[PDB]
Backbone:
């Protein structure tokens, strides 16, 4: 009833009562990139406004400690020119840290403390610039968003091929980009017991994808049929056609790995298939046509499938003719 | 709003309940009249006031005296009249009732619940009647002196009622939990004292000590959680009881500083 | 144009002319910087550890461990919030004669208040996460705030303005407070040495004796249980098991280890006192820490209606206490903490009463395990008497321990009451308050009368209850012989013996409640006629009138319970007499 | 007694008497990123202050060589305006290199040497900016800190499954992030001799992880049981239950590889297991529950294990029934 991963690719886990939070604290960076978009915007503006206001308060404290905030002056230079308010010191800290430098507010060589605070402000300004801009580019450049453009079938199918019952599904690209070294991991996740009484709630046992060599690696240009033949040692060996219903302890997850050709950064697309999502005795229609010296593929009829005369029993009894 | 207090007051008698409400309500009226006469008297600018103060004081003395004797007399009447009817009703019963109902329950009534209606209902009746009418009279006179008090009186009343409704289901559930863990400890005592010879014959002393340890652990932790419940509800209610003094102080000081209040009515409302 | 330090004339107070750290707004500006340092360090750390975790992910079920000095840090934090809101009030009343919004009196104290609440929230978050590799931010914050507070204080003393101005005594309390915070900080350094050199929570759902002190006061852990109360009702499952100190057999290890060291009812008394006197004096010291906070009611009333009956720039302390808004706020905070301390005293008294019951029931079971059946067969005790002893007498001991610290703190409350009565009203307060010491020996008189009434009543109730037990057991004989009318007649004879004792008991209790009420109102009549007549007319204001009335009310408000207390202690006395009788009975060799 | 890698993941090696240091010198970059945090902060501030002070000394030397430091002036322009101290030249070099440009100190076209030194200062300023900011972002973006969030069991267990003795342990994630193409390497490191007298101190022989296909690659969402069955050719084939004690020449290291889903940069988590850390005859409890249409996992009881009736002898004699 409750699926493991969604049809969209979202894992329905909870992670309740995690004990150690110090290991969460000891990497702030992965927690920093792994945020929502308004939280990342908020911490971006929070870090920059915090640094600007802190150095604003520092510059205003320096301009107060030298006493040039009092306009009763002689002829001596202030440590920062034309600062006579906290807001003017804030604007000066703005011009310093983001390196605008209008020059109406500028630093004279009177205060050496002003020189020192300008040095540390420039150092941590360059540091916060490197951190925040690299972090926001890594945030916008992660490739889980690329997995939104790799479609799957709503329904995985089981039919006959080469005398054997195989488990087929279709997966295609939506770009003329590539998924470099696109691997396939197909795992059967269900509750099973050991013969020795060991009970495990989600035993992620993985069927091998039938490739031709055995290395699970595909070439996704056209939406090809990926398929796993049901062997005797396969965990689908005793699957009934009547088993494909709701409230059936069976889930097939298909994990497409690879790296995006454009960004060069890697990714992973995932999808699920429940028992009442699997059609028995059906096969996919051909969706690739060839004309005008090219090849055409109709993604509008990507998911369609036809009925096929198929033996209505498990792959175990198929081996007895 | 249960039928039990209706049976209680019907056993009390109409004369006694009318004397109860007359004594208690006029006692709170004579006390609130004595502070009102003090507030009207202390702003001087002989014996125009402050001599009916004396007869008012002695009237309050004898009126709480008759309040005390009517609560003890209703206590004695419900002691005499809840007994001698239960006893005559139980003694005229078929033994089909005795063969069905456990005798331990009936003797637990005849011990514990008569003990409550003897030694606890007059004291709790007094401390309910002395508290609640003092509270509502003081609310009435902080309403009189400060006329703007009602618009903040309704928020505190509605949050009092809603925290009470938030708490009442937990209090009922945990109180029933304390009673159903109160039962098996006493029945374990009653069955140990009878079969003491067998339980010393069997050499089964340590395991029954363990069983009483488990029973007392369960009973003590249920009474501990009921204690924590009552203290949590009381500390939230007393936080509201501090906020009402805050709002009484701030509205009396707003309506004394640029108004007319004559500096005694604010002391009345603050007291 | 809002301005730090204000724009009074030519911005002349911005000048450094006489030297650095010589301007008051300059040492206020130095006072600003540790608070904003603390916020700007804490808020990213508080963000990244907690709240950065998303909606599905939930942390840290149980088994935290408190740092040493945690009680002292929280108490010092609460008085820090009190002195900082007093500083905020001083900032508001300072800029009443001057215009143009001197922000140096508000914003240091405001950022100090924000730093205080964020420091205690950060301490709580690092406490329940038990990571002492952090909190050096708190160490450097307390040093920085302490240094700038010493700078401001010695510059107060350098200009020689003090002890009548609120800022001076305020800053002195704040700097000794920050010194105590640095002391508890290096105490966290010293023991639990982490920088430069657990308690069992397997199945327990109580959590009360090991939690932070605010939620010890407010019982905030049970907010989850009352949240789950509007769900499935609570069971003995998910009520948890017992904490080890409040486990049974642990008390009664304490009680037998007090008994063997004791080497008799009076011996039982003194060794029970040795067993539970620590928790009992903690109960009563919460009780006397309360009701002196209660002795700020009448002082606040006298202050507000005493005002209402009428060195650059400063608020004197007398004019600060002349202002009645802050006296009302002080009264609100005082009543807040007073009710909190009274509730805590109630809780720990009931906890040691529960522990007393859990020990002595096990001791009764140990005596009943070795009791010879000859005592049961020949007279002196029945099974009904033994279960009566448990199910009534143990609760009588428990209720006496519920109401013990109240009678311990009664004389202290009334003596501070009569001394504060002498603080106003002059000598006529004593001639108005001598009626209470006149009616104090008749409390002993009615205590003796109540005592003999209860002594008769317990014996008669034992008689009637065992008679009812044998009648209800032998119902079958009784009805088939048709003897129930004469047996009910014998039961009504014992019931007449009940009612003839309960009538005198009720009459004497009504005598004591008549003694309990209207003696304070007689006291105010005596002192008020004897103040306006036969005495010199010495300031019969509304002020001392309502202060004395509220003081008499708060004096007699703990008087009005005493009848139930003396009934409880006489029931406990005859209870422990029967207890020492049963515990000294025959055995099996 | 001395473990090879720690339980935390730290290798306890020494690397004594390394001869060639020129190969250390011939890559300064990996040594630059592989520093402690205060050393990286120190070399950051050292490089920037060194460049600023060097060009400060250059600008002050130019303003001295043109003689405009002497205030006895005619009407001719200085090569840099309003410089009359070394500190003012330092502030000017500050405005040049970090590109603030207040303009009170600015360059006129009088000195061509000033133009040339401004060109080289801007070039190596852009160079040092690229080097230091990319280096500090790669320092904060390396993913050994991600390995702090991948937990393991304290105790690996050996029990029965499918009639065979298997070697099990549990490993789970603490985020809703992913480890893309998460591989497992389990190696037995111990001292063994050859039959021909070759003695080797730490022979890292690796057991294969029992997967179902044989490709050591998992799908870490829930904390799953990874386990290696003890085959005849496995090096655990002659392991006694009484062998699991201290001072026993046996160590099991578990190396989880993969790439972080968020950053896209790769990582490796590692852990060890000694002989007195391995429990015999025990198996892990199930820690995955299913409710509210989702799945819940209790990491507080992640490490708990129960006792199991198991034959108290080695896997060799188990093959003789």
Residues:
């Amino acid at each position: 009833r409750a699926r493991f991963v969604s049809k969209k690719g979202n894992c329905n886990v909870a992670h309740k009562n995690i004990r150690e939070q110090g290991r969460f604290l000891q990497d702030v960076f992965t927690t920093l990139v792994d945020l929502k978009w308004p939280h990342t915007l908020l911490i971006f503006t929070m870090s920059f406004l915090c640094s600007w206001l802190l150095f604003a308060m520092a510059w205003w404290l320096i301009a107060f400690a030298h006493g040039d905030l009092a306009p009763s002056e002689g002829t001596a230079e202030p440590c920062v020119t034309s600062i006579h308010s906290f807001s003017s010191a804030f604007l000066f800290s703005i011009e310093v840290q983001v390196t605008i430098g209008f020059g109406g507010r500028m630093v004279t060589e009177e205060c050496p403390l002003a020189i020192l605070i300008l040095i540390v402000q420039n150092i941590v300004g360059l540091m916060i610039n490197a951190i925040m801009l690299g972090s926001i580019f890594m945030k916008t450049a992660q490739a889980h968003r690329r997995a939104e453009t790799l479609i799957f079938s709503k329904h995985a199918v089981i039919a006959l091929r080469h005398g054997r019952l195989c488990f087929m599904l279709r997966v295609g690209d939506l770009r003329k980009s590539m998924i470099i070294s696109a691997t396939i991991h197909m795992q059967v996740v269900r509750k099973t017991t050991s013969p020795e009484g060991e009970v495990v709630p989600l035993h992620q046992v993985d069927i091998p994808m039938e490739n031709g060599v055995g290395g699970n690696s595909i070439f996704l240009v056209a939406p090809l049929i990926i398929y796993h033949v049901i062997d005797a040692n396969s965990p689908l060996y005793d699957l009934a056609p009547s088993d494909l219903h709701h409230h059936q302890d069976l889930e097939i997850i298909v994990i497409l790995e690879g790296v995006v050709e454009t960004t060069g950064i890697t990714t992973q697309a995932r999808t699920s298939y429940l028992a009442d999502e699997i059609l028995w005795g059906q096969r996919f229609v051909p969706i690739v046509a060839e004309e005008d010296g090219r090849y055409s593929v109709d993604y509008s009829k990507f998911d369609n499938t036809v009925k096929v005369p198929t033996p209505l029993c498990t792959a175990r009894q198929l081996d007895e003719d | 709003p249960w039928r039990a207090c209706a049976k209680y007051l019907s056993s009390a008698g109409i004369l006694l309940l009318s004397l109860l409400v007359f004594s208690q309500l006029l006692k709170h009226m004579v006390l609130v009249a004595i502070d009102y006469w003090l507030a009207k008297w202390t702003d001087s600018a002989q014996t125009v006031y402050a001599m009916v103060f004396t007869v008012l004081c002695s009237l309050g003395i004898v009126l709480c005296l008759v309040t005390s004797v009517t609560v003890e007399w209703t206590g004695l009447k419900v002691a005499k009249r809840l007994h001698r009817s239960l006893l005559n009703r139980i003694i005229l019963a078929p033994m089909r009732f005795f063969e069905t109902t456990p005798l331990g329950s009936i003797l637990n009534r005849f011990s514990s619940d008569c003990n409550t209606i003897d030694q606890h209902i007059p004291s709790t009746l007094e401390c309910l009647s002395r508290s609640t009418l003092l509270c509502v009279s003081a609310l009435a006179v902080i309403s009189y002196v400060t006329p703007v008090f009602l618009v903040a009186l309704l928020p505190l009343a509605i949050v009092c009622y809603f925290i009470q409704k938030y708490f009442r289901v937990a209090s009922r559930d945990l109180q029933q939990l304390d009673d159903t863990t109160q039962l098996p400890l006493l029945s374990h005592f009653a069955e140990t004292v009878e079969g003491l010879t067998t339980i010393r014959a069997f050499r089964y002393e340590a395991r029954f000590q363990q069983k009483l340890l488990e029973y007392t652990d369960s009973n003590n932790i249920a009474s501990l959680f009921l204690t924590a419940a009552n203290r949590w509800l009381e500390v939230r209610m007393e936080y509201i009881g501090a906020c009402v003094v805050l709002i009484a102080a701030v509205t009396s000081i707003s309506n004394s500083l640029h108004r007319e209040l004559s500096a005694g009515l604010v002391g009345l409302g603050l007291t | 144009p809002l301005a730090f330090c204000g724009s009074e004339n030519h911005s002349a107070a911005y000048r450094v002319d006489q030297g650095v750290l010589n301007n008051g707004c300059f040492v206020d500006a130095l006072n600003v910087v540790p608070h904003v340092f603390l916020l700007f360090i804490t808020f990213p750390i508080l963000f990244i550890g907690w709240g950065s975790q998303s909606s599905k992910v939930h942390i840290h079920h149980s088994t935290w461990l408190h740092f040493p000095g945690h009680n002292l840090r929280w108490i010092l934090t609460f008085m820090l919030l009190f002195v900082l809101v007093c500083e905020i009030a001083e900032g508001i009343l300072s800029d009443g004669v001057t215009e143009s919004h001197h922000l140096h009196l508000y914003m240091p104290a405001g950022m100090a208040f924000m730093a205080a609440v964020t420091s205690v929230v950060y301490y709580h978050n690092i406490e329940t996460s038990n990571f002492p590799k952090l909190l050096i931010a708190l160490l450097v914050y307390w040093t920085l705030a302490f240094i700038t507070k010493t700078i401001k204080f010695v510059k107060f003393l350098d200009h020689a303005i003090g002890f009548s101005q609120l800022r001076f005594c305020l800053t002195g309390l704040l700097v000794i407070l920050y010194g105590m915070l640095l002391l508890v900080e290096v105490n966290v350094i010293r023991v639990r040495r982490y920088i430069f050199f657990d308690l069992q929570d397997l199945g327990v759902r109580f959590l009360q004796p090991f939690v932070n002190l605010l939620s010890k006061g407010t019982y905030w852990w049970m907010n989850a249980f009352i949240k789950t109360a509007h769900k499935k009702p609570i069971d003995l499952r998910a009520i948890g098991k017992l904490p080890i100190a409040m486990r049974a057999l642990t008390n009664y290890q304490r009680l037998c280890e007090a008994f063997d060291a004791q080497v008799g009812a009076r011996a039982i008394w003194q060794a029970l006192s040795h067993a539970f006197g620590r928790r009992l004096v903690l109960s009563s010291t919460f009780r006397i820490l309360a009701d002196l906070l209660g002795f700020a009611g009448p002082l606040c009333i006298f202050g507000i209606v005493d005002h209402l009956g009428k060195g650059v720039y400063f608020v004197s302390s007398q004019e600060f206490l002349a202002n009645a808004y802050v006296l009302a706020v002080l009264l609100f905070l005082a009543l807040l903490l007073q009710r909190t301390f009274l509730q805590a005293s109630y809780y720990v008294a009931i906890e040691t009463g529960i522990n007393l019951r859990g020990a002595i029931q096990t001791k009764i079971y140990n005596k009943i395990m070795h009791l010879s059946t000859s005592n049961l067969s020949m007279g002196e005790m029945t099974a009904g008497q033994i279960c009566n002893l448990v199910a009534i007498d143990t609760n009588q001991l428990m209720w006496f321990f519920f109401l013990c610290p109240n009678l311990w703190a009664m004389p202290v409350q009334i003596i501070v009451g009569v001394i504060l009565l002498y603080y106003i009203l002059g000598v006529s307060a004593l001639i108005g308050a001598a009626v209470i010491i006149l009616l104090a020996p008749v409390q002993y008189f009615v205590a003796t009368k109540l005592s003999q009434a209860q002594r008769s009543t317990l014996e008669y109730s034992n008689e009637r209850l065992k008679q009812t037990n044998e009648m209800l057991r032998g119902i079958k004989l009784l009805k088939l012989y048709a003897w129930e009318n004469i047996f009910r007649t014998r039961v009504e004879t014992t019931r007449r013996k009940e009612m003839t004792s309960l009538r005198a008991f009720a009459i004497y209790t009504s005598i004591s409640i008549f003694m309990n009420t209207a003696i304070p109102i007689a006291a105010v009549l005596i002192t008020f006629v004897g103040h306006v007549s036969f005495f010199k007319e010495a300031d019969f204001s509304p002020s001392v009138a309502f202060a004395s009335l509220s003081l008499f009310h708060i004096l007699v408000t703990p008087l009005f319970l005493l009848s139930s207390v003396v009934r409880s202690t006489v029931k406990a006395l005859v209870s422990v007499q029967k207890l020492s009788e049963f515990l000294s009975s025959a055995e099996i060799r």
